[PDB]
C-alpha cells in the first residue's frame, strides 16, 4: 500500500497520442506471442536482473571497479548522441553533448556537486559492463536470469548477446527518439523511465537523419517543438507508451523507434539492457516485405551510393535528381 509510485505530472508533454504497451507475466502466452512477432511488451516478473535490484550509487561505487566510465554531459534535458567517426562529412555539425571518461566515484561526486550547487548541467552514465568490475558485481551479473533470456535467444533464432549497457541518468534526462539495429531486453533497476515506442512502419513520420550523418538513426524532429513545415507527417505519428520501474523488462524490438525519459523529479534511474544481434535474413523472402526489411533496404541504398559516388555529400543530390518529376 506504498502509494502511487509516480503520477502524470512527472511526464513531459508531447503533441501525439499513444496507446499503452501491454504489461504481462513472462508465463503469459500473449507475451510470448508479442515477442515472437516483434512487438513490444513489458514483462513484470522475469527476475532478469533480480540481483541488481539492490544497486544504488553507493553499492556501485564500492563494488564496480576502478575502470573508466563514459559519462555524457548536456546543457539541456535532451541527450542527442553522435557518431564521432562520421563528423567529417557534415562539417556544419557541432555536438550538443560532450563525453568524458572518469572513475565511477568521480561521477558520483559530479552529481553531488551539481545537486549541492543547484547546477543546471545534466549527466548520463552509459557504460558497457566489462572485465574490470568488482567481485560483487560479477556475482550479481552471474545471478541474472540467464535461463530465461537464453531461452528467448534460442526461440527467436537471435544471434549473440553483444553487450550489456549500464545506464545511470538524472531525473528529467531524455534520450531522443531513435532505433537500434539489435534486439533489446531493457531491464529497469532503479527509478522510473517513460518509454515511447513507434513501429518501423512510421519511418515516414519520424524523419531519420541521413545514414552518413553523426546522428544516424535518430529522429530529426524536436519532440518539444515539432517543425511541421519540414516534417509534416509528424502530425500522423502514434506511439506505444509505458512507464517501467524496478523489476520490469521492456522488450524493444529491433528497428522500433524509442524515446526514453527519466521521470521528472523521480531521482536517479538505473537500467541494464541486453543487446542481441537479430536473426539472419530468411532463406526465402516473403512478399510484400515487412517494414523493417524496407528500412534495411533504404539504409543500404544510402550506404552504397555514399561509397559508389566516392562521397556521401553527393547522396542527397543524386537521390533528388532520381525522383523530382519522375517518381513524385
Amino acid at each position: 500500500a506504498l502509494g502511487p509510485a509516480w503520477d502524470e505530472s512527472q511526464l513531459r508533454s508531447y503533441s501525439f497520442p499513444t496507446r499503452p504497451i501491454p504489461r504481462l507475466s513472462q508465463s503469459d502466452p500473449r507475451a510470448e506471442e508479442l515477442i515472437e512477432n516483434e512487438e513490444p511488451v513489458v514483462l513484470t516478473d522475469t527476475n532478469l536482473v533480480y540481483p541488481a535490484l539492490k544497486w544504488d550509487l553507493e553499492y556501485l561505487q564500492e563494488n564496480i571497479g576502478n575502470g573508466d566510465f563514459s559519462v555524457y554531459s548536456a546543457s539541456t534535458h535532451k541527450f542527442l548522441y553522435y557518431d564521432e567517426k562520421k563528423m567529417a562529412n557534415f562539417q556544419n555539425f557541432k555536438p550538443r553533448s560532450n563525453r568524458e571518461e572518469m572513475k565511477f566515484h568521480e561521477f558520483v561526486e559530479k552529481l553531488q556537486d551539481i545537486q549541492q550547487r543547484g547546477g543546471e548541467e545534466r549527466l548520463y552514465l552509459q557504460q558497457t559492463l566489462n572485465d574490470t568490475v568488482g567481485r560483487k558485481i560479477v556475482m550479481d551479473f552471474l545471478g541474472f536470469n540467464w535461463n530465461w533470456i537464453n531461452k528467448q535467444q534460442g526461440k527467436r533464432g537471435w544471434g549473440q548477446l553483444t553487450s550489456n549497457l549500464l545506464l545511470i541518468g538524472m531525473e528529467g534526462n531524455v534520450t531522443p527518439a531513435h532505433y537500434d539495429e539489435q534486439q533489446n531486453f531493457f531491464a529497469q533497476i532503479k527509478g522510473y523511465k517513460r518509454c515511447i515506442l513507434f513501429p518501423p512502419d512510421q519511418f515516414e513520420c519520424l524523419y531519420p537523419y541521413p545514414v552518413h550523418h553523426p546522428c544516424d538513426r535518430q529522429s530529426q524532429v524536436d519532440f518539444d517543438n515539432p517543425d511541421y513545415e519540414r516534417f509534416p507527417n509528424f502530425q500522423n505519428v502514434v506511439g506505444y507508451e509505458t512507464v517501467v520501474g524496478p523489476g520490469d523488462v521492456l522488450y524493444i524490438p529491433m528497428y522500433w523507434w524509442h524515446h526514453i525519459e527519466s521521470l521528472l523529479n523521480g531521482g536517479i534511474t538505473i537500467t541494464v539492457n541486453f543487446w542481441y544481434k537479430g536473426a539472419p535474413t530468411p532463406k526465402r523472402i516473403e512478399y510484400p516485405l515487412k517494414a523493417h526489411q524496407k528500412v534495411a533496404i533504404m539504409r543500404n541504398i544510402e550506404k552504397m551510393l555514399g561509397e559508389a559516388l566516392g562521397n556521401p555529400q553527393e547522396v542527397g543530390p543524386l537521390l533528388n535528381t532520381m525522383i523530382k518529376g519522375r517518381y513524385n
Binding site: D83, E84, S163, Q182, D216, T281, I285, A296, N300
Partner: peptide, 16 residues
C-alpha cells in the same frame, strides 16, 4: 541482390 539489400548492420546507441 535482394539478400544484399536486405542485410542489416548491428549499430546501437552511441556509435555502433
Amino acid at each position: 541482390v535482394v539478400k544484399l539489400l536486405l542485410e542489416h548492420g548491428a549499430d546501437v546507441x552511441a556509435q555502433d
